[PDB]
Amino acid sequence: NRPLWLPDVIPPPHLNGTLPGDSGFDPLGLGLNEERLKWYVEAEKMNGRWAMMAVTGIMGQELLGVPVKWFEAGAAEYDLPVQAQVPILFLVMGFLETKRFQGFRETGTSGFINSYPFDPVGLNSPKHAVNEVKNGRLAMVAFVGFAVQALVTRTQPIEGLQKHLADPFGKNITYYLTHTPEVIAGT
Amino acid sequence: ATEGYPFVPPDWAPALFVPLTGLVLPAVGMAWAFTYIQKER
Amino acid sequence: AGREMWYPGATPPPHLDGSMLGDYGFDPLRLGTNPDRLKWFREAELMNGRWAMAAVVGILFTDLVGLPKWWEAGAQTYPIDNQTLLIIEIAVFSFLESKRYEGYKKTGGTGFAFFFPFDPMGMRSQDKELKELKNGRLAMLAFLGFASTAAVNGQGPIESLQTHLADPAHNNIFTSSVGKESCVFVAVLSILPMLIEANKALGKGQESVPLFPWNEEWEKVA
Amino acid sequence: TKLFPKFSQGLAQDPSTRRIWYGLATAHDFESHDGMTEENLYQKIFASHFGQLAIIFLWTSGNLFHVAWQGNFEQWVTDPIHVRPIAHAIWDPHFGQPAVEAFTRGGASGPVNIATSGVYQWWYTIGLRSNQELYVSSVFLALVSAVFLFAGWLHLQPNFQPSLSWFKDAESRLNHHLAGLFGVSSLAWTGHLVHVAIPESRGQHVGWDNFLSVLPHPQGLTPFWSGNWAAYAQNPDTASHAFGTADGSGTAILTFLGGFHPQTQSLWLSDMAHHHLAIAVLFIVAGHMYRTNFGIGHRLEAILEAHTPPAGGLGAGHKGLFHTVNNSLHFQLGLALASVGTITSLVAQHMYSLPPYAYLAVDFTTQASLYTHHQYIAGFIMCGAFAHGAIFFIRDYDPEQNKGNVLARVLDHKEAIISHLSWVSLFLGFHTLGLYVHNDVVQAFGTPEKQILIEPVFAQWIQAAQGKSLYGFDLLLASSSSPAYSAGQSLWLPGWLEAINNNQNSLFLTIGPGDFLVHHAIALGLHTTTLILVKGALDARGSKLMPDKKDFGYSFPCDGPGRGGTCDISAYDAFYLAVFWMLNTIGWVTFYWHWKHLTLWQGNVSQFDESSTYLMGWLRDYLWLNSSQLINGYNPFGMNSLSVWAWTFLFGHLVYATGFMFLISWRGYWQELIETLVWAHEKTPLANLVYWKDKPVALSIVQARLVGLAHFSVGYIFTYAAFLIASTAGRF
Amino acid sequence: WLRDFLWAQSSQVIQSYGSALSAYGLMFLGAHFVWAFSLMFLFSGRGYWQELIESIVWAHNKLRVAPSIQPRALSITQGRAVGVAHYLLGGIATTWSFFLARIIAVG
Amino acid sequence: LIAAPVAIGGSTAALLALGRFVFLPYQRRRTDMEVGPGRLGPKTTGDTFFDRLQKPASFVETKSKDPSGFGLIDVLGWGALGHVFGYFLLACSSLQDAGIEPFPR
Numbered sequence A: 001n002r003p004l005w006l007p008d009v010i011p012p013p014h015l016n017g018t019l020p021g022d023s024g025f026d027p028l029g030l031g032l033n034e035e036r037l038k039w040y041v042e043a044e045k046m047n048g049r050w051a052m053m054a055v056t057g058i059m060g061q062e063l064l065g066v067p068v069k070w071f072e073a074g075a076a077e078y079d080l081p082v083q084a085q086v087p088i089l090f091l092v093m094g095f096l097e098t099k100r101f102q103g104f105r106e107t108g109t110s111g112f113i114n115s116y117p118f119d120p121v122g123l124n125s126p127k128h129a130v131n132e133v134k135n136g137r138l139a140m141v142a143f144v145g146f147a148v149q150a151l152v153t154r155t156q157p158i159e160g161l162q163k164h165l166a167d168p169f170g171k172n173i174t175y176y177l178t179h180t181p182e183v184i185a186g187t
Numbered sequence B: 001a002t003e004g005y006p007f008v009p010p011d012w013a014p015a016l017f018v019p020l021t022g023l024v025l026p027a028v029g030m031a032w033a034f035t036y037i038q039k040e041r
Numbered sequence C: 001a002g003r004e005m006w007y008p009g010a011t012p013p014p015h016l017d018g019s020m021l022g023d024y025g026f027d028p029l030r031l032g033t034n035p036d037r038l039k040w041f042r043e044a045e046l047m048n049g050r051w052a053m054a055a056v057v058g059i060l061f062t063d064l065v066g067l068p069k070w071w072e073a074g075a076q077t078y079p080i081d082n083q084t085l086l087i088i089e090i091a092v093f094s095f096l097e098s099k100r101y102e103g104y105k106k107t108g109g110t111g112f113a114f115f116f117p118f119d120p121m122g123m124r125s126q127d128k129e130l131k132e133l134k135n136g137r138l139a140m141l142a143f144l145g146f147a148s149t150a151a152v153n154g155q156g157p158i159e160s161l162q163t164h165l166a167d168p169a170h171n172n173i174f175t176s177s178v179g180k181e182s183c184v185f186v187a188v189l190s191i192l193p194m195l196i197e198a199n200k201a202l203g204k205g206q207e208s209v210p211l212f213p214w215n216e217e218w219e220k221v222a
Numbered sequence D: 001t002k003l004f005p006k007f008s009q010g011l012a013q014d015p016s017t018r019r020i021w022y023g024l025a026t027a028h029d030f031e032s033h034d035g036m037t038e039e040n041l042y043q044k045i046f047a048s049h050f051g052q053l054a055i056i057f058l059w060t061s062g063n064l065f066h067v068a069w070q071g072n073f074e075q076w077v078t079d080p081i082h083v084r085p086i087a088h089a090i091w092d093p094h095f096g097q098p099a100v101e102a103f104t105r106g107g108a109s110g111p112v113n114i115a116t117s118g119v120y121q122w123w124y125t126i127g128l129r130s131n132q133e134l135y136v137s138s139v140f141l142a143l144v145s146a147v148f149l150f151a152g153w154l155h156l157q158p159n160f161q162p163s164l165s166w167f168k169d170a171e172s173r174l175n176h177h178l179a180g181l182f183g184v185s186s187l188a189w190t191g192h193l194v195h196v197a198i199p200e201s202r203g204q205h206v207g208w209d210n211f212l213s214v215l216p217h218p219q220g221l222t223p224f225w226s227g228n229w230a231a232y233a234q235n236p237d238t239a240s241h242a243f244g245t246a247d248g249s250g251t252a253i254l255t256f257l258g259g260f261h262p263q264t265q266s267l268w269l270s271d272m273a274h275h276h277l278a279i280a281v282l283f284i285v286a287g288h289m290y291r292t293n294f295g296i297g298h299r300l301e302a303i304l305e306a307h308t309p310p311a312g313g314l315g316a317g318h319k320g321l322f323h324t325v326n327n328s329l330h331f332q333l334g335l336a337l338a339s340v341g342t343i344t345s346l347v348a349q350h351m352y353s354l355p356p357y358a359y360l361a362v363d364f365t366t367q368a369s370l371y372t373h374h375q376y377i378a379g380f381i382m383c384g385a386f387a388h389g390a391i392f393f394i395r396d397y398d399p400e401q402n403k404g405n406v407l408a409r410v411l412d413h414k415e416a417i418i419s420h421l422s423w424v425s426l427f428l429g430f431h432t433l434g435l436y437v438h439n440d441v442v443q444a445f446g447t448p449e450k451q452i453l454i455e456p457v458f459a460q461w462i463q464a465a466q467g468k469s470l471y472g473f474d475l476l477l478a479s480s481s482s483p484a485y486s487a488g489q490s491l492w493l494p495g496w497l498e499a500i501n502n503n504q505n506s507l508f509l510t511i512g513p514g515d516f517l518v519h520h521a522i523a524l525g526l527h528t529t530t531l532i533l534v535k536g537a538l539d540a541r542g543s544k545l546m547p548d549k550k551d552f553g554y555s556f557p558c559d560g561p562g563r564g565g566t567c568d569i570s571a572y573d574a575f576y577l578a579v580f581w582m583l584n585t586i587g588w589v590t591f592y593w594h595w596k597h598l599t600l601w602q603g604n605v606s607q608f609d610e611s612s613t614y615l616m617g618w619l620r621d622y623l624w625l626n627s628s629q630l631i632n633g634y635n636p637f638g639m640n641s642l643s644v645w646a647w648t649f650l651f652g653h654l655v656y657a658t659g660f661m662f663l664i665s666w667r668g669y670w671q672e673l674i675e676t677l678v679w680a681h682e683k684t685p686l687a688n689l690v691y692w693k694d695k696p697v698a699l700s701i702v703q704a705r706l707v708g709l710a711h712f713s714v715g716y717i718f719t720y721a722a723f724l725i726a727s728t729a730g731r732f
Numbered sequence E: 001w002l003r004d005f006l007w008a009q010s011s012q013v014i015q016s017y018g019s020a021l022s023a024y025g026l027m028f029l030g031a032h033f034v035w036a037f038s039l040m041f042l043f044s045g046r047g048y049w050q051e052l053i054e055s056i057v058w059a060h061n062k063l064r065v066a067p068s069i070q071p072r073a074l075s076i077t078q079g080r081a082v083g084v085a086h087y088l089l090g091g092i093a094t095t096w097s098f099f100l101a102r103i104i105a106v107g
Numbered sequence F: 001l002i003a004a005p006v007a008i009g010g011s012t013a014a015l016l017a018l019g020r021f022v023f024l025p026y027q028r029r030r031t032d033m034e035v036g037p038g039r040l041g042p043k044t045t046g047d048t049f050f051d052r053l054q055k056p057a058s059f060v061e062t063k064s065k066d067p068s069g070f071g072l073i074d075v076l077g078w079g080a081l082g083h084v085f086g087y088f089l090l091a092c093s094s095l096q097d098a099g100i101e102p103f104p105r
């Protein structure tokens, strides 16, 4: 009854289909426990949301023409030094995550602060939840791709995209895995 | 300091820390253990 | 332990039911688990806080009027030699603290000399005690900050405030020699309520009392 | 009724001082704890293993922290052959003014302790150069120790406590540990070697800031995706290469030159890089063998039941052994301890002959301490292996579960095995002592040519088979026409032959008749320790003197004076007597190592060759000649740096003597003496007010054996460590 | 005491080989042997040795060389007596050899 | 040096063809005498979360649509064998063309 995973029949015992974005992808069986299942649902949504905001920040920074690259953003001269974020960077997010955990103890969903539905505009539909989960998985794949661009290609993501459009055969995985690693180091 | 941020302890730290673990920590150990053994239910 | 808590979502300690005022659930090591111990620690907290209040307001007054630095004020010239000054200080305190301890034995109040409680005006109310406790703890932290900024910065509170107002991005604690120490310490303090929450979440029904040499809460463990 | 033995309600009812000692001794004997099931026992062992992991990581983090704080690691990096390593500073308020002045070694200011643990050479080899990196390593290891602490606490809460069947999953455990704990761990290690240690040995600093900007090989992973793996082994480091600079160096990350570095006298970095890479690949391949949730794999029970030879060679074979190993935790513990002790012995025998750390061979005292430490550790671990095998035999061995298998058949003819071990031990000891006494009384009569010098032809033949041309046996790997020499003639033969034909290093030293005699003494010690441990294990559950030994527990004192006398009848006392033989055997092997290496370092190998034959020469030229600088640590004339080693020497003597105090005298006279002391305390003024809550009771017989063995062993270890490091540090 | 009495002396006992006092060095090392051999009878008990004797009796039973008199381990009092006798003999002969060799080679 | 694409492809095609048309009838006979109907069979029995991990997966028994019993796991294993053999041949060629002879002469 589900659009399912890979070609065709792979019936999941603990994934009936009521879960948002459920396709039966559990080849090794890690989510049999129900409490662990809902915790991993929430944690998948968390890494997906952070992947969303990470990748959108990356292409927004590249499209708006900032000089520093996203992988070299740590060591540059800014108005507040790196020693000055990590006090309140840790403090405010520790407060936020502690509030959200003490709310998740009894609610079982996400939420910013107190107002756990967190819907000023509403439109909370199961279709929106499935869209959130699947676009989140796409965001994780995209951020992994961006990190491996920074590692191997050592270039910006949209710059690598433009390289793929400009020379599709000559900027593939073979060129950037064999011809480049002696050249990119001091290119 | 030039990357002393993996914090280098002071050059006077042994004078405080050696008697702390040679005289005070054994005293706390003996007192705590002796309260443990002579405890009736 | 009061609806307002040391971190939001915390559970009160079993002995910290909130009967005494100023309770915020803040007892990680659980130093005082006996009601006599709890009230003695409250009296000691009030004593140290009152001395912190007096010392801090004296510090602001002396820095405002232009008198020299407090940690170097012990070496300055003064009338009456410090030997007999110390001797008369113990001579008067061996009576003052004696009267304080005897009044605490017979009444428990924080009176002065022969007046127990020493409240001639008469604004005796629980809200006054709560305000005194809060301002006292704030003065405790303020004196610790004063000692720290006298140690590493070498300047008074007024000079420290002017350096913070002049360039707050870089003239803070976190860019000093005790900077990354404070960064790691406050990161540990930010992580700290979550580890307590994790202990409460995994330990759904267990006591999970912090067993330590200063308290006999481990007697119920075994 | 007390509450200190919370695990043992019966021990809490004991009103004597025996309760404290027995609660401390039976602290982690969870199988004998009151009201405890199998699953909770397994979970407790899991948490305990996490605790030992956290302790190990905290200890090594402290080693890094103390070396980075009070050591001379930068000065050692600048000059390894001259500057001595420093372990930790000495802050002893009981020290005198000369005592402070006599411990500022290594170019330090305060009193410091010279490090012979080998961490300086190891950290210089793996690319650690500054104390900043050691500080970062210390804080990271403390962090992962805290992580292991939290994980050990994590697997004790509900919804997180693993089930009993999770622990008994054998195939998936072996698959995962062999694939990741060995394979990908070695892959990460050889990646670290190639990225950091290979450039850091060639003057190229590789750190966290620039390892993504520098490249390990100039080809840059093109050999790996393609087939041209020989591009990595193209330009290795030359003979005239310095481990700190790039003088005469090459660009190679994986090479198999073999032998030793001509400057550091250590194995090549590319050699161990390709070694750990090949080990990683082989272990990841071997980690995909046992059966898991997928349809492919191997089942251990199927392999065990299938390997039953025809015609009743082993009876039922290995049938019914899978449940025996899985259900009995002591079987797995004994197997693990046996393999760990054997491989610790292998590590000890392979570190000194093939030093993997730069300038480790130059540091003689460090190599001696490392070999002695790991050999004594291996001996203790093998003794524990046999003891826990005995515990398996008495506690959780089910004969009807595995009837007619290899285990039941071995238990059936246990008398034959014990008798043959006794025969070979008696024969070895008889003839070894006979030849030693013969040669020694022959040397006494002024005619040293009459001593029996049996040349070790077998091991010299083996050495010539490995390429040693000193003995003249023109066998394979020593002749140019042999196929074994031709195979690998261009791979690693010119390095291995050059390293094995040089007598300056410790690789395959020349051996004489004294070497063969002390080798036979070593074999005698191993055989006798094996004999007693095997006899204790096989007679752990039954004997002709006592058929019902399995009903009395593993560690019980005796059965009484009846039936002739049953003292030391348990397998625990068999282990206790075997620890003495283990200590004597490791003492023999360390005496041999220390004397041969000392005569090599001093240059008079002929002194060892002509003096190790007879025991008087052994005593005079090892325990007397090398102890001259040790006992001169604090003369009435003055004190030197070896004053701590002389004090430790006499300290070990005193603790060994107190071990004799607990070992010779037995409990029963001490009980009457304690009774007289009880009467003295109860019937005196000003002291009868103070009364004991725990009744003073003399140490139990099992407890007496334990404390005598413990004192004996720590005294032995301390006095030999003091003598070894004083004799190796007094001259060099 | 150690360095200036047992090590400053006894240098002539170890160097007595090839001379008239070599028998004192032989007596010294044999006394070391007998003193060390005593600790087997002192630390150990009887049950382990009785079981080892049972295994040896099985070995002699396999090829029918069983003695008519049944081999038994030494008694606990017997074992203590053997241990103390060998210990005393080893120590006395050790001191005897050391003292005599030192006082003859020097005095 | 041997071309790495053609060598790896030929080795993995040979190994996959062997595992499907050749050793697949020999395969699963070892499993009939290893985990077969009358043999040891199930690894675990309990019904807790730490026991369902030892239970067999859900994508390994779905009657893969190949005419034989060649499933995804068998495809992965025989392709791993093919990649191993191709890399072994390429490694031997790399040692050969560098002027170094590992064979006895």
Ligand code: CLA
Pocket (backbone or CB within 6 Å): D306, D307, D308, D309, D310, D312, D313, D314, D317
């Ligand atoms: C050419 C014919 C041939 C030969 C020579 C062998 C030989 C062997 N097979 Mg066999 N086998 C064959 C054909 C053959 N196989 C065939 C056709 C099949 C059917 C496919 C099998 C199936 C088969 C199975 C299923 C098993 C064997 C096993 C064995 C080994 C042990 C045999 C045995 O009973 O233990 C020897 C007999 C004894 C009674 C053992 C006595 C050992 C003594 C007591 C130990 C002495 C210790 C001593 C102190 C050591 C001193 C060392 C010193 C350094 C201290 C042996 C190497 C077994 C195996 O793998 O083990 C390795 C096994 O499980 N075989």
Ligand code: CLA
Pocket (backbone or CB within 6 Å): D422, D423, D425, D426, D427, D428, D429, D430, D433, D524, D528, D531, D532, D577, D578, D580, D581, E033, E036, E037, E038, E039, E040, E041, E043, E044, E052
């Ligand atoms: C250095 C002192 C020393 C010596 C020499 C021995 C010697 C022996 N012990 Mg050991 N033992 C010792 C200390 C010592 N022990 C200590 C301190 C302990 C801890 C309690 C043990 C614990 C122990 C156990 C638990 C076991 C042994 C066993 C053995 C025997 C091993 C067999 C062997 O090596 O061939 C023989 C080795 C010899 C050195 C032969 C000594 C005999 C020579 C030839 C002299 C014979 C007499 C001579 C001809 C003169 C005759 C006259 C004279 C009798 C008056 C052997 C008799 C094992 C055993 O007996 O089973 C086989 C055994 O199971 N011992």
Ligand code: CLA
Pocket (backbone or CB within 6 Å): D024, D025, D026, D027, D028, D029, D030, D333, D337, D380, D381, D383, D384, D385, D387, D388, D391, D554, D555, D572, D575, D710, D711, D714
């Ligand atoms: C990693 C390996 C390993 C593991 C998991 C175990 C685990 C176990 N063993 Mg085993 N064992 C080991 C190694 C191991 N042992 C080794 C290496 C030896 C040889 C020394 C033994 C010898 C041994 C025996 C003989 C017995 C056990 C027993 C036990 C059980 C409880 C022991 C215990 O914790 O009491 C806690 C013990 C103590 C707290 C006493 C500590 C005193 C130590 C041992 C003396 C050290 C000397 C000195 C004081 C050190 C300080 C020096 C000073 C200068 C500072 C438990 C099943 C016992 C058992 O199963 O019960 C029937 C048992 O009878 N084991």
Ligand SMILES: CC1=C(/C=C/C(C)=C/C=C/C(C)=C/C=C/C=C(C)/C=C/C=C(C)/C=C/C2=C(C)CCCC2(C)C)C(C)(C)CCC1
Pocket (backbone or CB within 6 Å): D330, D331, D332, D333, D334, D335, D338, D342, D382, D385, D386, D387, D388, D389, D390, D392, D393, D534, D537
């Ligand atoms: C009591 C008991 C126990 C224990 C036991 C033990 C402890 C054992 C040990 C054992 C051991 C400890 C063993 C060892 C072995 C070894 C071996 C077996 C080896 C081999 C080797 C080889 C085979 C080699 C070869 C070679 C090579 C490879 C190279 C060079 C050349 C040559 C050829 C030499 C248990 C637990 C079971 C349980 C039951 C009872």
Ligand SMILES: CC1=C(/C=C/C(C)=C/C=C\C(C)=C/C=C/C=C(C)\C=C\C=C(C)\C=C\C2=C(C)CCCC2(C)C)C(C)(C)CCC1
Pocket (backbone or CB within 6 Å): D281, F012, F075, F076, F077, F078, F079, F080, F083, F084, F085, F087
């Ligand atoms: C459907 C079909 C088909 C097709 C098939 C295919 C296409 C398959 C797949 C695939 C393939 C075709 C292959 C596979 C493979 C797999 C795997 C799984 C692999 C692995 C590998 C590995 C594991 C490697 C390793 C390594 C490394 C990493 C490096 C170094 C070296 C070595 C080797 C060690 C045909 C047409 C025939 C027919 C019809 C149907």
Ligand SMILES: CC1=C(C/C=C(\C)CCC[C@H](C)CCC[C@H](C)CCCC(C)C)C(=O)c2ccccc2C1=O
Pocket (backbone or CB within 6 Å): E040, E041, E042, E044, E045, E046, E049, E072, E073, E074, E075, E076, E078, E079, E080
């Ligand atoms: C070794 C030992 C034994 C075993 C020793 C026994 C049984 C005595 C053996 C005496 C022998 C048989 C005397 C004769 C020795 C030689 C045969 C003499 C050789 C002479 C040559 C000329 C051939 C015990 O019985 C015992 C009992 C209690 C505590 C400790 C121990 C103990 O340590």
